[PDB]
Amino acid sequence: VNSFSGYLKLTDNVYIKNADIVEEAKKVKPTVVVNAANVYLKHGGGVAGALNKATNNAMQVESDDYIATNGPLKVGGSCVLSGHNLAKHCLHVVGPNVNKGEDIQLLKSAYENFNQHEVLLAPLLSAGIFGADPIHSLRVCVDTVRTNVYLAVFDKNLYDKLVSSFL
Ligand SMILES: O=C(O)C1(c2ccc(Cl)c(Br)c2)CC1
């Protein structure tokens, strides 16, 4: 039993809700919140910009030190950093950005990072400003993630479309 509330159950391990991931993280304080990161951990907009804003820029400060030490992530890769006031940990995951020409096949590799964590609060990878079809992202999530994932979808219209079209 966990504290996630109001989710629709899609499969044995995947759950979904129309919610602002920032507000959901502040309420649940999950062990892991997933960020929709880029390779530079520049949290400018989309989910990343919103999460970073909620940390009063502490996420960005920590991320800049991470990059200075380690260099950029790979597309499809991830790193674990602090969750600050939102979660115990933040798993920064880089899905391919279609608006940069990146290979959509890398979306499966991106979701594989979730399997290293038993339970996660997450957005749909490569959705929103990353330019992929969120219906496809949900399909890849369900077919790749085996651990327990709670998906927050900000847009109500999109949430209803994802549910109504789910096979
Ligand atoms: O939750 C949402 O509405 C969606 C999303 C996902 C990731 C990012 Cl980065 C942004 Br922006 C938006 C899925 C469309």
UniProtKB/Swiss-Prot annotation:
It comes from the Viruses. Inhibited in vitro by GRL-0617. It is a multi-pass membrane protein. It catalyses: Thiol-dependent hydrolysis of ester, thioester, amide, peptide and isopeptide bonds formed by the C-terminal Gly of ubiquitin (a 76-residue protein attached to proteins as an intracellular targeting signal). Residues 1-167 form the Macro domain. It is found in: Host endoplasmic reticulum membrane. Responsible for the cleavages located at the N-terminus of the replicase polyprotein. Participates together with nsp4 in the assembly of virally-induced cytoplasmic double-membrane vesicles necessary for viral replication. Antagonizes innate immune induction of type I interferon by blocking the phosphorylation, dimerization and subsequent nuclear translocation of host IRF3. Also prevents host NF-kappa-B signaling. In addition, PL-PRO possesses a deubiquitinating/deISGylating activity and processes both 'Lys-48'- and 'Lys-63'-linked polyubiquitin chains from cellular substrates. May form homohexamers. Interacts with N protein. This is Papain-like protease nsp3. The gene is rep. The chain holds residues 1025 to 1191 of 7096 of the full protein.
